[PDB]
Amino acid sequence: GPSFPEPKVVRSQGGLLSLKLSATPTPLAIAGQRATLLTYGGSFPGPTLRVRPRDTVRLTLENRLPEPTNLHWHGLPISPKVDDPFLEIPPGESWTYEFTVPKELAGTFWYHPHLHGRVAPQLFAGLLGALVVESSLDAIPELREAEEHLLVLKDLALQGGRPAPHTPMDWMNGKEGDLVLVNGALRPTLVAQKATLRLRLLNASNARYYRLALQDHPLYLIAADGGFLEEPLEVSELLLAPGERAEVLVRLRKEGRFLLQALPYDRGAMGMMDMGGMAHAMPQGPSRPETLLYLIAPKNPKPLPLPKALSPFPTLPAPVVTRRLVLTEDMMAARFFINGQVFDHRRVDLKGQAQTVEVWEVENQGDMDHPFHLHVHPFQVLSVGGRPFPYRAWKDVVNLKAGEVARLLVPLREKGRTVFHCHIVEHEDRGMMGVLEVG
Amino acid sequence: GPSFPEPKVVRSQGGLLSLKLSATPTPLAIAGQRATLLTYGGSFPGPTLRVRPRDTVRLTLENRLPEPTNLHWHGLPISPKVDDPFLEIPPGESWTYEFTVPKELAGTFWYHPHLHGRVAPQLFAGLLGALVVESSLDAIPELREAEEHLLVLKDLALQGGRPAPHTPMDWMNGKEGDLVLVNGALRPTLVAQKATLRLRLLNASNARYYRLALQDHPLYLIAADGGFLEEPLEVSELLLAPGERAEVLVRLRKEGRFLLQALPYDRGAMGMMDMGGMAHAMPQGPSRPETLLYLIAPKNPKPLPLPKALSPFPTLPAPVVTRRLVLTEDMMAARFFINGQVFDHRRVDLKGQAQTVEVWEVENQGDMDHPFHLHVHPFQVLSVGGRPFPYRAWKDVVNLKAGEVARLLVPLREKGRTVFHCHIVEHEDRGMMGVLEVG
Ligand SMILES: [Cu+2]
Ligand SMILES: [Cu+2]
Ligand SMILES: [Cu+2]
Ligand SMILES: [Cu+2]
Ligand SMILES: [Cu+2]
Ligand SMILES: [Cu+2]
Ligand code: NA
Ligand code: NA
Listing DSSP states for B286-331 in one string gives SPPPEEEEEEEEPSS--PPPPPS---PPPPPPPPSEEEEEEEEEEG
Find the distance separating the first CA and the last CA of chain A, reported in whole Å.
Answer: 50
Q: Residue A301: what residue type?
A: P
Equal fold, B135-311 vs B312-439 = yes
What is the distance in A from the centroid of ligand 1 to the CA of A137? 25
> Are B256 and B297 a contacting pair, CB within 8 Å?
yes
Q: Exposure string (b/e) for B125-141, b if CB count within 10 Å is 16 or more? A: bbbbbbbbbbbebeeee
CB-based contact B158:B208 (threshold 8 Å): no
Instruction: Check residue A160 and report its DSSP letter.
Output: T
Could you tell me if residue B304 is left (phi over 0), alpha (psi between -120 and 50 degrees) or otherwise beta? beta
CB pairs under 8 A between A and B: 5
Instruction: Classify domain A1-134 by CATH number.
Output: 2.60.40.420
In whole angstroms, give the CA distance from residue A127 to residue A34: 17
Is the Cβ–Cβ distance between B233 and B173 less than 8 Å?
Answer: no
Tell whether A373 is in a known binding site: no
Please tell me if residue A390 touches chain B, with a CB cutoff of 8 Å. no
Task: Give the whole-angstrom CA distance, residue A431 versus residue A74.
Answer: 19
Chain A contact for B308 (CB, 8 A cutoff): yes
Rg (CA), chain A: 21
Residue pair B155/B177 in contact by the 8 Å Cβ criterion: yes
> Residue A423 annotated as binding?
yes
Residue B299 forms contact with A (CB below 8 Å): no
Nearest CA-CA distance, residue A178 and chain B, Å = 32
Sequence-ordered list of residues with C-beta below 8 angstroms from that of B413, at least 6 positions apart, any chain = B77, B354, B355, B376, B377, B378, B438
Task: Decide if A276 touches B, using CB distance below 8 A.
Answer: no
For residues A333 and A348, give the distance between their C-alpha atoms in angstroms, rounded to a whole number: 25
Interface check for B216 against chain A (CB to CB < 8 A): the answer is: no
- Identify whether the C-beta of residue A113 lies closer than 8 Å to the C-beta of residue A69: yes
State the distance from the centre of ligand 2 to the C-alpha of A336, rounded, in angstroms: 7
In angstroms, the CA B23 to CA B128 distance is 10
The alpha-carbon gap from A154 to the nearest alpha carbon of chain B, in Å, equals 31
Local structure of residue B347 (DSSP, 8 states):
-
The ligand placed nearest to the CA atom of residue A20 is: 7
Closest residue in A to B303 (Cα–Cα) = A234
- For Cα atoms B108, B111, B112, give the angle at the middle one, nearest 5 degrees: 140
Distance, in angstroms, between A266 CA and closest chain B CA?
A: 22
SS3 B245: strand
Q: How far is B390 from chain A (nearest CA, A)?
A: 12
Q: B76 with B100: CB under 8 angstroms?
A: no
Query: Smallest Cα–Cα separation from B113: which of B124, B123, B105?
Result: B123
Is A308 at the interface with chain B, CB within 8 A? yes
- Residue A305 with chain B: CB contacts under 8 Å: 234
Q: Considering Cα of A96, then A102, then A108, then A114, what sign does the dihedral take?
A: negative
**Is B390 near chain A, with CB under 8 Å?**
no
Q: Burial of A54 by CB count in 10 Å (0-12 exposed, 13-18 middle, 19+ buried)?
A: exposed
Phi-psi region at B387: left, alpha or beta (left = phi > 0; alpha = psi -120 to 50): beta
Q: CB under 8 Å to A166, separation ≥6 — which residues?
A: A120, A121, A124, A175, A426
Q: How far apart are CA B380 and CA B366, in angstroms?
A: 23
Cα gap A406→A389, rounded to integer Å? 10
B300 reaches A (C-beta below 8 A): no
Q: Please, where are the H alpha helices in B363-429?
A: 425-429
Domain boundaries, chain B: 1-134, 135-311, 312-439
Residues of A in contact with B305 (CB under 8 A): 234
Yes or no, beta carbons of B234 and A305 under 8 Å apart = yes
Task: Give the Cα separation of A24 and A36 in Å (integer).
Answer: 10
Chain A residues whose beta carbon lies within 8 Å of the beta carbon of residue B231: 308
User: What is the strand order of the sheet A16-30 is part of?
Assistant: A33-40, A16-30, A56-63, A94-100
Q: Which amino acid is at A375?
A: H
- CA separation for the pair B311, A249 (Å, rounded): 27
Q: Which of A65, A51, A50, A48 lies closest to A128, judged by CA?
A: A48
Cα B244 to ligand 6 centre (Å)? 12
A218–chain B nearest CA distance, Å: 10
Contacts of B308 in chain A (CB under 8 A): 231, 308
Rounded-to-integer distance, Cα B421 and Cα B362, Å: 11
Cβ-contact B255, B299 below 8 angstroms: yes
- CA dist list (Å): B237 to A238, A311, B214, B219: 29, 32, 8, 7
A105 burial via Cβ count (<10 Å: 0-12, 13-18, 19+): buried
- Using DSSP bridges, classify how beta strands B189-191 and B290-297 pair: parallel, antiparallel or unpaired: parallel
Q: The dihedral of CA A256, A262, A264, A265: what is its sign? A: positive
Catalogue the long-range contacts made by A381-390 (C-beta closer than 8 Å, 24 or more residues apart).
Answer: A381/A406, A381/A407, A381/A408, A382/A407, A382/A408, A382/A409, A383/A407, A390/A233
Q: Which residues of A touch B234 (CB under 8 A)?
A: 305
Give ∠ CA A112-A118-A121 in degrees, rounded to 5: 75
| Strand partners of residue B341 | B338
Closest residue on chain A to B217 (Cα): A253
Q: How was this structure determined?
A: X-ray
The answer to whether the Cβ–Cβ distance between A234 and B308 falls below 8 Å is no
Which protein residues have a CB closer than 5 Å to ligand 8 (ion)? Answer: B 22, 24, 42
CB A201 within 8 A of CB A212: yes
- Do B308 and A308 count as a contact with CB atoms less than 8 A apart? yes
- A308: which chain B residues are within 8 Å (Cβ-Cβ)? 231, 308
Cβ–Cβ gap A308/B305 under 8 Å? no
Between β-strands A379-384 and B196-203, what pairing exists: parallel, antiparallel or unpaired? unpaired
Q: How far is CA B327 from CA A14, B336, B341, B421, in A?
A: 62, 8, 9, 10
Ligand 4 centroid–CA B205 distance in Å is: 10
Which of B145, B129, B100 has the alpha carbon at shortest distance from B303? B145
Its CATH architecture, for the domain B312-439, is: Sandwich (2.60)
A217 among annotated binding-site residues: no
Can you tell me whether residue A219 is helix, strand or coil?
A: strand
Ligand sitting nearest the alpha carbon of A38: 7
A149 is in an annotated binding site: no
Mutation pick from B214, B229, B234, B304 vs chain A, by most beta carbons of A within 10 Å, is B234
CB burial class (10 A; 0-12, 13-18, 19+) of residue A73? buried
Q: What is the DSSP string of B5-71?
A: --PPEEE-BTTEEEEEEEEEEEEEEETTEEEEEEEETTBSSPPEEEE-TT-EEEEEEEE-SSS-B--
Best of A253, A255, A302 to substitute, by most chain B Cβ atoms within 10 angstroms, is A253
Whether A349 contacts A314, CB under 8 Å: no
Tell which A residues from 218 to 247 touch B, by Cβ distance under 8 Å.
231, 234
- Options 2.60.40.420, 3.60.20.10, 2.40.50.140, 3.40.50.880; which CATH number does A135-311 get? 2.60.40.420
Ligand at minimal distance from the CA of B419 is 6
Contacts of A309 in chain B (CB under 8 A): none
- The CA distance from B6 to A432, in Å, is 63
Which-ligand-closest: CA of A111? 1
Please give the residue of chain A at the shortest CA–CA distance from B301.
A236
Residue B139 in 3-state DSSP? helix
Positive or negative: CA dihedral B382, B388, B391, B396: negative
User: How far is residue B6's CA from residue B2's CA, in Å, rounded to a whole number?
Assistant: 9
